[PDB]
Nucleic acid binder design. Structure first.
Ligand SMILES: [Mg+2]
Ligand SMILES: [Mg+2]
Ligand SMILES: [Mg+2]
Ligand SMILES: [Mg+2]
Ligand SMILES: [Mg+2]
Ligand SMILES: [Mg+2]
Ligand SMILES: [Mg+2]
Ligand SMILES: [Mg+2]
Ligand SMILES: [Mg+2]
Ligand SMILES: [Mg+2]
Ligand SMILES: [Mg+2]
Ligand SMILES: [Mg+2]
Ligand SMILES: [Mg+2]
Ligand SMILES: [Mg+2]
Ligand SMILES: [Mg+2]
Ligand SMILES: [Mg+2]
Ligand SMILES: [Mg+2]
Ligand SMILES: [Mg+2]
Ligand SMILES: [Mg+2]
Ligand SMILES: [Mg+2]
Ligand SMILES: [Mg+2]
Ligand SMILES: [Mg+2]
Ligand SMILES: [Mg+2]
Ligand SMILES: [Mg+2]
Ligand SMILES: [Mg+2]
Ligand SMILES: [Mg+2]
Ligand SMILES: [Mg+2]
Ligand SMILES: [Mg+2]
Ligand SMILES: [Mg+2]
Ligand SMILES: [Mg+2]
Ligand SMILES: [Mg+2]
Ligand SMILES: [Mg+2]
Ligand SMILES: [Mg+2]
Lengths: 194, 195, 115, 119
RNA sequence: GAAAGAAUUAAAUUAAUAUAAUGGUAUAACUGUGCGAUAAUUGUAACACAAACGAGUGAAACAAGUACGUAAGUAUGGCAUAAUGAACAAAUAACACUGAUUGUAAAGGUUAUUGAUAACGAAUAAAAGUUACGCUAGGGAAGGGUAAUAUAGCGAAAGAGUAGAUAUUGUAAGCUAUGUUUGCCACCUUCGACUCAACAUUUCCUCUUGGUUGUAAAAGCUAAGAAGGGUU
RNA sequence: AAUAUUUAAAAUCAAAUAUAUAUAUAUUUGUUAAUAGAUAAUAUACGGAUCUUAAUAAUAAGAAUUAUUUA
RNA sequence: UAGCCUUUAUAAAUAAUAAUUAUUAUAUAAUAUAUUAUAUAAAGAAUGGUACAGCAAUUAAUAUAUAUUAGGGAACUAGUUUUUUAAUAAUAUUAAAUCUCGAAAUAUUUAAUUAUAUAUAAUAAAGAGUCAGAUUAUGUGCGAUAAGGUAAAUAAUCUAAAGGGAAACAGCCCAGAUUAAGAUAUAAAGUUCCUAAUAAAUAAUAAGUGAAAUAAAUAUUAAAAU
């Protein structure tokens, strides 16, 4: 917001914060032939909290990501010092990976076609999930990770497996458009929508 | 409700200072904003203490509690710290210890202001008078139709203050820095800045 | 108790050479903490951000459109020159040196070379 | 408390009369300075003293000090001033925010004309 | 109409800065990175700032050599402001200056370097008390001011007063008076008893008077006038 | 003539300045008193005297207080 | 030792002190909108953050039949009628030695010109005293918005200053004694007598209020605006 110029002290005064937020928010344009929603990236987050005591679990998690996805994993390092959780700073706690194009297409296809159907009690993705400007996030557990072809093929080499969050970033202006797009890609939704 | 006991993280001793004399005609705090009757200083600017303000507060509350949806607003906060020293002490040896909170009340400011469905001007007047008898200055009653005291013997009306934009005045009498910014946004400078 | 009577003497900061004043090489124009005044042209800045003239001239305080929100102090090579000089105009330069009319001095300088 | 500086809090009629004359004298000095500048301007333009004095158009001073001193809102003339501000001066440590002008040091030489609008 | 660039504008110095606080910093002084580890080098330093001295601060320019850079150029430690100590006497190295009859020495000098005098411009390598037995030369480095305290009144009246704030009473706060108290400043370096008392009134008694569901009488409480007499 | 905030020159109104010659802008000034509260110690302490006026009524007095001013 | 004072001098000497021009804009003309010229207005070349002003960011305070969060107050098988406590938003009010988004005057200070030359500044040789300060005003720290208190910051005077006024008076108002004279103009202060010197106008006071050191809250009695 801008200060009304009714007082001289408003001449060089920095502008005010947005009414409800400390951060500015984007504008929403009508959907037209040039701005249809679509998938732009997928990011997988694997933070093994039990790696606080054992650094090798980070390497195992990176290998899990590499085998599932096929891209180069990138390490995750601790940033905060929380005693109650016994989390120090500067240690390797896991791995991440970002997917685009054919590789993310394959990852989503295999998820929907193989892994999600093999979950015990799976209703879909919560309809009240995702950042308010396009993007849907949902998680997977270790037993769920065991369903991927690479792990099932060589169970022997996987005494322990780790869960991970999955963040799908799309071009949707708002979240419900992204939900429709993912439903088109066959991603079930169960909860009540906002 | 901490008007008589600010919650400063680091409690610090403060210098004596002086009660401001608003020679620029400042009317900040000298208008009715929350209620319908009010109490305002009339004598020279003075200093009020938390104990005196609390005594005035309960004096007014004795009249405000027996009312239908009656409210009292406290326009003043004791945001200055004061120190005391024992009488059996030589001058010097640094400052003393914290004694009490205090507020500097200029001539025209409004201390309390009340409203109520069953309120009546005479009742408000007696309440405010009794409350004023417990403060170290001279005080008077203010209503919504009353002028704003800008001095000991001078009043004024807020409607006389002209409303004016200042962006336009700045534009019409620019500053050297403003002209520099404007001349920096010209293409022959922007296109050659080199950064 | 613990008396509070420790303080450092005032650092003599501030402008040491005012606008229109004539200055020579090396003279200190401003002493400051940080760059409240940036150096313009014909002037340099030291470790402690001291502004000092590099050529003889006249001290001028000014503002430059290329650097908005930045005050500048500089040295004009003549009084009649506005210091925020035109951008597309040849730079005013001072040769400074003097010709060695003396035959012996010219000979020595001619025969002096680097290592 | 201890010393006796028996300075009364209010002036007398004679003191007030002298103060009025002093104010008038300063006004006269300002007026004469402006008139001299005007006559000099006329004589520089070519006219002589007689029609410089008789000139219908009077030249106003171009210096900041003289222009401000000539503005009544900055240096009001004696007849323009108020009786209050002729004899009482503004003080922020005194009851009523005023003190006798005769309690100002060297008050017969220094000049005070204006006090804050509402004081 | 659409992609990919180049970027521009608003905002931001609140994060970060090796370390307090202040000033500065996005054009970054902050952060990442390749070389590098070089300028955390050598001999003259003008001129300024600051300044009693002694010291301190910025630094153009000339010369010798390095590292980075295509180049322009940058670098004489750290974004800046603290991070410190004289001279004497010792000690180590280099220089090639003097070598007390000559020769070499010894010793001195020049250049570089080391150890701290924290009462931190550092008396000496080396030092605490007591005097009511005390001595000399000096200075003063109850009255006066103040009214926090004490005492007294006034305004207002929350509450007691079988009922009613104002017969009496008046608890936190407000406005003043005194200069009798305890203190405060530093102009000015005997408590009690005996005897004789003079003065004030803020009246204890004696005279006049108003009030008192709370003055039936008597005895009282409260208050106004009153210093003539009296007051173990 | 009666119910009757406030103690004011801000706002309004009235006089004046500087620009303006058929009128406007700007500026300067003009908004209460008396008493009570009241207050000690050698002696009343405006420095003292004393200072407020009044026809008949004579040469001839009527603030010597406060607030604005003149000669 | 520096600072403040004194004697004697030096020139390719005015370098000293004070003020003005510097700027922005308008009008009317020109010249060639851009200038130049004249007149006028504006607290008027460069530097700065005090008063004032303000609540921006920081630090603190108040309010809401407006929203988020938590325990969750007559029916009850998850979901209220609400003058329910605290925190976060929204809106409206507030202040501060170590807060300035606005911002004075004095102030610092530059070149040229003008004025001051029976006058400043700088430099050379040489000689001291001083290094216990005091009030009065205006901003402050401490003290209690006490002190003839104490600590420093601008004047001025006493110190080392006679003379007039403040009754008397180191410091306040005016004025600086080479020696006289006493005609004229006076400063501050005064003009009924003591005591040099006055006549009036318009209102108010009745209380000896007051008249050369104004004592407060409050109470009573009186004055006019609608
Ligand atoms: Mg303020
Ligand atoms: Mg300092
Ligand atoms: Mg650093
Ligand atoms: Mg900082
Ligand atoms: Mg200097
Ligand atoms: Mg030196
Ligand atoms: Mg660096
Ligand atoms: Mg030899
Ligand atoms: Mg020998
Ligand atoms: Mg040797
Ligand atoms: Mg010592
Ligand atoms: Mg020492
Ligand atoms: Mg020292
Ligand atoms: Mg010793
Ligand atoms: Mg003994
Ligand atoms: Mg009762
Ligand atoms: Mg009490
Ligand atoms: Mg009596
Ligand atoms: Mg009886
Ligand atoms: Mg007016
Ligand atoms: Mg007496
Ligand atoms: Mg000396
Ligand atoms: Mg500012
Ligand atoms: Mg300050
Ligand atoms: Mg000159
Ligand atoms: Mg001394
Ligand atoms: Mg003193
Ligand atoms: Mg003198
Ligand atoms: Mg002496
Ligand atoms: Mg004298
Ligand atoms: Mg007299
Ligand atoms: Mg005398
Ligand atoms: Mg009297």
């Amino acid at each position: 917001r801008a200060w009304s110029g009714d007082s001289p002290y408003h001449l060089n005064r920095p502008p005010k914060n947005p009414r409800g937020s400390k951060a500015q928010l984007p504008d929403i344009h009508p959907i037209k032939w040039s701005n249809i929603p679509g998938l732009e990236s997928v990011v997988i987050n694997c933070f093994v909290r039990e790696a606080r005591e054992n650094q090798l679990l980070a390497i195992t998690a990176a290998l899990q990501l590499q085998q599932i996805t096929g891209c180069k994993p990138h390490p995750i390092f601790s940033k905060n010092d929380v005693p109650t959780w016994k989390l120090r700073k500067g240690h390797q706690m896991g791995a991440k990976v970002e997917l685009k194009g054919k590789e993310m297409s394959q990852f989503l296809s295999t998820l929907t076609e193989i892994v999600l159907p093999r979950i015990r009690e799976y209703k879909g993705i919560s309809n009240q999930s995702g950042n308010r400007f396009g993007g849907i996030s949902f998680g997977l557990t270790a037993e769920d990770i065991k369903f991927f072809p690479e792990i099932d093929a060589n169970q022997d080499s996987w005494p322990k497996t780790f869960g991970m969050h999955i963040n799908i970033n799309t071009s949707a202006q708002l979240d419900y458009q992204a939900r429709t797009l993912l439903s088109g890609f066959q991603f079930p939704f169960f909860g009540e929508e906002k | 409700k901490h008007e008589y006991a600010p919650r400063f993280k680091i409690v610090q001793k403060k210098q004596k200072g002086r009660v401001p004399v608003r020679t620029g005609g400042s009317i900040k705090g000298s208008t009715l904003q929350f209620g319908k009757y009010g109490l305002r200083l009339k004598s020279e600017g003075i200093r009020i203490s938390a104990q005196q303000l609390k005594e005035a507060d309960n004096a007014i509350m004795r009249y405000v509690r027996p009312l239908n949806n009656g409210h009292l607003w406290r326009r003043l906060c004791t945001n200055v710290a004061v120190c005391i020293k024992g009488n059996e002490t030589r001058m010097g040896k640094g400052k003393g210890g914290f004694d009490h909170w205090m507020v500097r009340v200029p001539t025209g400011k409004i201390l309390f202001e009340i409203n109520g469905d069953d309120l009546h001007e005479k009742v408000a007047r007696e309440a405010f008078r009794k409350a004023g008898t417990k403060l170290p200055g001279v005080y008077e009653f203010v209503s919504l139709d009353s002028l704003v005291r800008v001095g000991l013997h001078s009043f004024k009306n807020p409607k006389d203050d002209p409303v004016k934009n200042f962006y336009d005045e700045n534009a019409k009498k620019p500053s050297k820095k403003y002209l520099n910014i404007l001349k920096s946004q010209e293409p022959q400078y922007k296109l050659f800045r080199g950064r | 108790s613990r008396t509070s009577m420790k303080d450092s003497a005032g650092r003599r900061l501030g402008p040491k050479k005012y606008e229109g004043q004539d200055v020579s090489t090396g003279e200190i124009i401003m002493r400051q903490r940080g760059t409240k005044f940036y150096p313009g042209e014909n002037v340099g800045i030291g470790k402690d951000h001291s502004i000092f003239a590099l050529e003889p001239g006249v001290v001028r305080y000014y503002l430059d459109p290329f650097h908005p929100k930045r005050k500048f102090i500089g040295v004009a090579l003549r009084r009649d020159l506005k210091l925020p000089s035109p951008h597309f105009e040849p730079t005013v330069r001072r040769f400074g040196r003097f010709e060695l009319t003396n035959k012996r001095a010219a000979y020595k300088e001619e025969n002096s070379i680097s290592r | 408390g201890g010393l006796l500086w028996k300075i009364p809090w209010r002036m007398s009629t004679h003191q007030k009369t002298r103060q009025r004359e002093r104010l008038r004298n300063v006004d006269q000095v300002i007026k004469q300075l402006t008139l001299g500048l005007h006559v000099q301007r006329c004589q520089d333009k070519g006219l002589t003293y007689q029609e410089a004095m008789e000139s219908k158009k009077k030249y106003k001073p171009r210096s900041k000090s003289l222009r401000l001193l000539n503005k009544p809102s900055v240096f009001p003339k004696e007849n323009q001033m108020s009786s209050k501000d002729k004899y009482w001066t503004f003080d922020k440590k005194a009851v009523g925010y005023r003190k006798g002008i005769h309690k100002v040091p060297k008050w017969t030489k220094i000049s005070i004309r204006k006090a804050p609008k509402f004081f």
